[PDB]
């Protein structure tokens, strides 16, 4: 919500409360999303200041507050900042921001990250360029310097983050994206590559000094219809775990396909169907093994722009013998959302 | 404060800063509330969206920020989310919200939870239905479908929460409350029952597979006067600790009595007197033992709706030989509060 | 930003997003400020309520949200409340607030704490009176009861805080400050003394039962110019570590000098030069040793009151043989800031 607009500075304080429950058989440990309370909240601000007719400064901060923890020793489990960046945008030249922000490969993966609760499986947090990540400097350009309607490109530098776990670390890297949208249709490509840390190279799974992620998208978002597909591959980038041996690392190679189709009815119902499959190859000791494999049926009803409720069913196609121990059981999510 | 009201959506951003100090003899370890700085802050939002003439969506989130921690390794001690839920309310049919919210037995215990700083001893957090707890779905009904002025009832389902400590866990359960208010007087009853987890059943103190909590209330809240009483009992529900053996568990049986009397003077002074006693029975190795036993003398001065100050003295009647090692010393609280 | 002003109560919701990176050779472990992403955000409120023509109530809360952590197990590293206090101010009699607030010796050290990113080296958090600290009651007086233009004084009581580390603890104490400002010039003195806890007295470094801190300031803040100097000394108060032996404690004696010079150009550029040196004496096993020793060159450009970017270079003069192992290498910070 826009709570302040004076002297060329506008501030948007936003947030939501999501009452959320997951249903899965038994513990949910062998299921797609687990079982139990999953309630959480969000808080954020987005600011915009008019520096002059051609220059605009901006910043944003976004936090996740879990609502399924006790008030005791686990009070903080799963709380974190999601976004924290500031930047400048000038005329048609382009914009530059630095901070914690979405990796550039998410410009493609965003096409299919549209499901009520799930989906976007390959857009991992703190996983180089596929998702939210810290210390990224990002140049973006809209309509190619103002000369070509609908053509956009982005270049992003990723600073090295040497963290205490291999899962959340990364080295220096550079990535980019290009997208063109014309009359309902959209197509987009993005590529990113970066060094791996000594800690990552020391993990049992994944072998190499370089990480690579790329993805292409095709979408149609015209006349209440939404159709989108993604394809992508990664090298030494997708985080995996062998639950049998309790071995963590990265997949040497992955192949990912994401499809989504949705329709928005005028009375507020938005049915959703989707398919996602992520297979891994050349995993030490295993070889080929599916990481994600499911169909999705769900729907969201929108009471208005502030209130909505949704159901999300995952028809999980992972088999019970999966060599990494990926969960094979189904998961259904039910939620009620208030946002401002 | 209402910081946004447009297009049928209104948002309330609230919070407070409480400068707070406790005085107790010596170190305060053997006292009712301890000793030292107890400053803290609150931040929250409450939202309300008009879906139509009869339907109203809503959400709320509330956080506690301790202000008596260093900026180092203990920076987070005692920080937690207190409330996080969203819901819908329709006409006179009733309202339903899910998330972290007050257990239904608090509908009764609220009568006496009115002291400046202390009191409400039996409304434990993450203790089934007596206080704030996660993953509760709650239906409430005002004026019995619009047919009976002043008669309210509520039904609440508690999802199972298998946490890493028995103190903060719970199984599935159902509870309810009923209340009637007519011209200053209020009477209310509430009951709740739920399964215990394997972790709770494994604790030295407390024996049984089921937990039970109930409470009744009588109050008068007319003409600057406030008088209220609560009585209640619990089975295998009230959390207790034997400090001698460092044994934690639940009390097999408790009996609780809470009394409060207050008057609000027009110039801003609100004196308060109270009595609270909670005795436990059939505690393994102990038998009967008082958990809470004190008189309270205090007062709040209200400068206006935003500023207030208060003193709160606990005349602690727990004796020094108490078999569980409950603190026997007095405690005085002094505080200054800014809220918006 | 002032997001609410009604019925005599005004609320200022503020915050910022700082995109920040440090450059230092290698890891930065042997450097002044380290190396890597240092992005962070702030959120805060400041409230003011008119009780009557002569009385005003107020409160403030301020939190630091780090933006250089993953979304995993380290999500909370470095998050903390910075300020949390409420108070009353009456006419010319004075103001009183209690809570977590700036120690009174910061009234002097503030003169030089003016650098874009660094500086203010001797204003340690949770270090008695030199910086932010919890449980302090503070009386302040402006213009000596309204009788003497420009003369201010402050008296502060520090409650004992027995924490789990000697670094962040303190005993009871009292301190004060006095300042006089006339036509661009400012001079200020402050002194504070307090008991040490048993845990602090048990540390290998630092010997004594009392802690003492004092500082004087001379500043000129007129006609776009800012010049300021500080000098100060401390006894058993400045926290130190011997990295060779991994021994933590306090410095028996320190001598600190801080100089800053800046000019604000009308087009938004504010160049900054500074010097800071803090030497320690009679450190057990070491004797005399420099704690801080550097020159500073930097600058901030102000696009307007909401947007700014800055560079901050530390010409580190600490030598590589320093007996405590204090870092000898340089550090450069680059940042982009959005605030509201």
> How would you write chain B as a 3-class SS string?
CEEEEECCEEEEEEEEEEEEEEEECCCCCCECCCCEECCEEEEEEEEEEEEECCEEEEEEEEEEEECCCCCCCCCCCCCEEEEEEEEEEECCCEEEEEEEEECCCHHHHCCCCCCCCCCCCCCCCCCCCCCEEEEEEEEEECHHHHCCCCEEEEEEEECCECCCCCCCCECCEEEEEEEEEECCEEEEEEEEEEECCHHHHCCCECCCCEEEEEEEEEEECCCCEEEEEEEEEEEEEEEEEECCCCEEEEEEEEEEEEEEEEECCCCCEEEEEEEEEEEEEEECCCEEEEEEEEEEEEEEEECCCCEEEEEEEEEECCCCCCCCCCCCECEEEEEEEEEC
Residues near B114 by beta carbon (within 8 Å), at least 6 away in sequence: B226, B228, B260, B262, B272
In angstroms, the separation between the Cα of residue A74 and the nearest Cα of chain B is 8
The kind and range of the H/E element at C245 are none
| Main-chain dihedrals φ then ψ at residue C168, nearest 5 degrees | -105, 10
Q: What whole-number distance in Å separates Cα of residue B15 and Cα of residue B65?
A: 10
**Which runs of consecutive H residues, i.e. helices, occur in chain C?**
106-109, 143-146, 198-201
In angstroms, the separation between the Cα of residue C19 and the nearest Cα of chain A is 5
3-state secondary structure of A33: coil
In angstroms, the separation between the Cα of residue A320 and the nearest Cα of chain C is 28
Residue A334: which of A33, A1, A131 has the closest Cα?
A33
Residues near A297 by beta carbon (within 8 Å), at least 6 away in sequence: A272, A273, A313, A315
Other residues' Cβ atoms within 10 Å of the Cβ of residue C17: 32
For C37, which of A4, A125, A134 is closest by C-beta distance? A134
Q: What whole-number distance in Å separates Cα of residue C89 and Cα of residue C98?
A: 12
Q: What whole-number distance in Å separates Cα of residue C338 and Cα of residue C104?
A: 29
Strand partners, B263: B225
Contact C310, C298 (CB under 8 A): yes
Interface test with C, best of B39, B73, B301 (most C CBs within 10 A): B39
On the 0-12 / 13-18 / 19+ scale of CB atoms within 10 A, C180 is: middle
Other residues' Cβ atoms within 10 Å of the Cβ of residue B298: 22
Contact C310, C117 (CB under 8 A): yes
Contact C98, C292 (CB under 8 A): no
Q: What whole-number distance in Å separates Cα of residue C41 and Cα of residue C18?
A: 6
Binary contact (B71, C132; C-beta < 8 A): yes
Q: Which two tokens stand for residue A178?
A: 């290009």
Contact A44, A64 (CB under 8 A): no
Residue A190: which of A209, A176, A203, A204 has the closest Cα?
A176
C-alpha triplet B144, B149, B152: angle, nearest 5°: 40
Q: What whole-number distance in Å separates Cα of residue A65 and Cα of residue A226?
A: 30
The kind and range of the H/E element at A215 are strand A210-220
Q: What are the chain C neighbours of A3 within 8 Å (beta carbons)?
A: 1, 3, 13
Residue C98: which of B312, B75, B17 has the closest Cα?
B17
Rama region for B86: left / alpha / beta (φ>0; ψ in -120 to 50; rest):
beta
3-state secondary structure of C201: helix
Q: What whole-number distance in Å separates Cα of residue C235 and Cα of residue C130?
A: 12
Say how far residue A219 (Cα) sits from the centre of its chain.
17
Nearest CA in chain C to A10: C340
A-to-C residue pairs, Cβ atoms closer than 8 angstroms: 146
Contact C250, C240 (CB under 8 A): yes
Binary contact (C39, A134; C-beta < 8 A): yes
Binary contact (B340, C126; C-beta < 8 A): no
Q: Which residue has the tokens 């990295």?
A: C243
Residues near A201 by beta carbon (within 8 Å), at least 6 away in sequence: A207, A208, A209
Other residues' Cβ atoms within 10 Å of the Cβ of residue A337: 22
Q: What are the chain C neighbours of A125 within 8 Å (beta carbons)?
A: 70-71
For chain A, the residue count is 340
For B99, which of A39, A303, A307 is closest by C-beta distance? A39
3-state secondary structure of A324: coil
Q: What are the chain C neighbours of A88 within 8 Å (beta carbons)?
A: 303, 307, 336
Residue B129: which of B163, B87, B172 has the closest Cα?
B172
Q: What whole-number distance in Å separates Cα of residue C98 and Cα of residue C87?
A: 6
Q: Is C10 on the interface with B (CB under 8 A)?
A: no
In angstroms, the separation between the Cα of residue B280 and the nearest Cα of chain A is 23
Contact C108, C178 (CB under 8 A): no
Interface test with B, best of C6, C66, C134 (most B CBs within 10 A): C134
**Which runs of consecutive H residues, i.e. helices, occur in C237-299?**
none
C-alpha triplet C42, C45, C47: angle, nearest 5°: 160
Q: What whole-number distance in Å separates Cα of residue B40 and Cα of residue B35?
A: 15
Q: What whole-number distance in Å separates Cα of residue C127 and Cα of residue C239?
A: 8
For C160, which of B36, B43, B65 is closest by C-beta distance? B36
End-to-end alpha-carbon separation of chain A, Å? 6
**Which runs of consecutive H residues, i.e. helices, occur in A41-172?**
106-109, 143-146
Q: Which two tokens stand for residue C339?
A: 């605030």
Q: Which residue has the tokens 């309509």?
A: A143
Binary contact (C161, B37; C-beta < 8 A): yes
DSSP string of C88-106? EEETTTEEEEEEEEE-TTH
End-to-end alpha-carbon separation of chain C, Å? 6
What approach was used to elucidate this structure? X-ray
| Cα pseudo-dihedral B63, B66, B67, B73, rounded to 10 | -120
3-state secondary structure of C200: helix
Q: What whole-number distance in Å separates Cα of residue B82 and Cα of residue B104?
A: 16
Binary contact (A98, C69; C-beta < 8 A): no
Contact C79, C66 (CB under 8 A): yes
Residue A101: which of A162, A31, A159, A27 has the closest Cα?
A159
For C17, which of A13, A59, A163 is closest by C-beta distance? A59
Q: What are the chain A neighbours of B168 within 8 Å (beta carbons)?
A: 70-72, 74
Distances (CA, A) of B297 to A122, B227, B315, C190, C289: 60, 14, 8, 40, 56
Q: What whole-number distance in Å separates Cα of residue B271 and Cα of residue B309?
A: 12
Q: What whole-number distance in Å separates Cα of residue B92 and Cα of residue B145?
A: 5
Strands A247-263 and A225-242: antiparallel
Q: Which two tokens stand for residue A270?
A: 């938005």
HSE-CB at A322 with a 13 A cutoff on CA atoms is: 24
Q: What whole-number distance in Å separates Cα of residue B324 and Cα of residue B248?
A: 10
């Amino acid at each position: 919500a826009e709570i302040y607009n004076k002297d060329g500075n506008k501030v948007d304080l936003y947030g939501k409360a999501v009452g959320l429950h997951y249903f899965s058989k038994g513990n949910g440990e062998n299921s797609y999303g687990g079982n139990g309370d999953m309630t959480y909240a969000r808080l954020g601000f987005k600011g915009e200041t008019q520096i002059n007719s051609d220059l605009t400064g901006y910043g944003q901060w976004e936090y996740n507050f879990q609502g399924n923890n006790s008030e005791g020793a686990d009070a903080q489990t799963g709380n974190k900042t999601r976004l924290a960046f500031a930047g400048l945008k000038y005329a048609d030249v382009g914009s530059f921001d630095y901070g914690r922000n979405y990796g550039v490969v998410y410009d493609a993966l965003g096409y299919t990250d549209m499901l009520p609760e799930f989906g976007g499986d390959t857009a991992y947090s703190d996983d180089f360029f596929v998702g939210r990540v810290g210390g990224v400097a990002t140049y973006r350009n809209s309509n190619f310097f103002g000369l070509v309607d609908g053509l956009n490109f982005a270049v992003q530098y990723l600073g090295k983050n040497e963290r205490d776990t291999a899962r959340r670390s990364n080295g220096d890297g550079v990535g980019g994206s290009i997208s063109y949208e014309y009359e309902g249709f959209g197509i987009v490509g993005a590529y990113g590559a970066a060094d791996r840390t000594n800690l990552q190279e020391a993990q049992p799974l994944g072998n190499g000094k370089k990480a690579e992620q790329w993805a292409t998208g095709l979408k149609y978002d015209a006349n209440n219809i939404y159709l989108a597909a993604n394809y992508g591959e990664t090298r030494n980038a997708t985080p995996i775990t062998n639950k049998f041996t309790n071995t963590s690392g990265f997949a040497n190679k992955t192949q990912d396909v994401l499809l989504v189709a949705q329709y928005q009815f005028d009375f507020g119902l938005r049915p959703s169907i989707a398919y996602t499959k992520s297979k891994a190859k050349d995993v030490e000791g295993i070889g080929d093994v599916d990481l994600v494999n499911y169909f999705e049926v769900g729907a969201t009803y929108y009471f208005n722009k502030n209130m909505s409720t949704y159901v999300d069913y995952i028809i999980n196609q992972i088999d019970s013998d999966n060599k990494l121990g990926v969960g094979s059981d189904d998961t259904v999510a039910v939620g009620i959302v208030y946002q401002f």
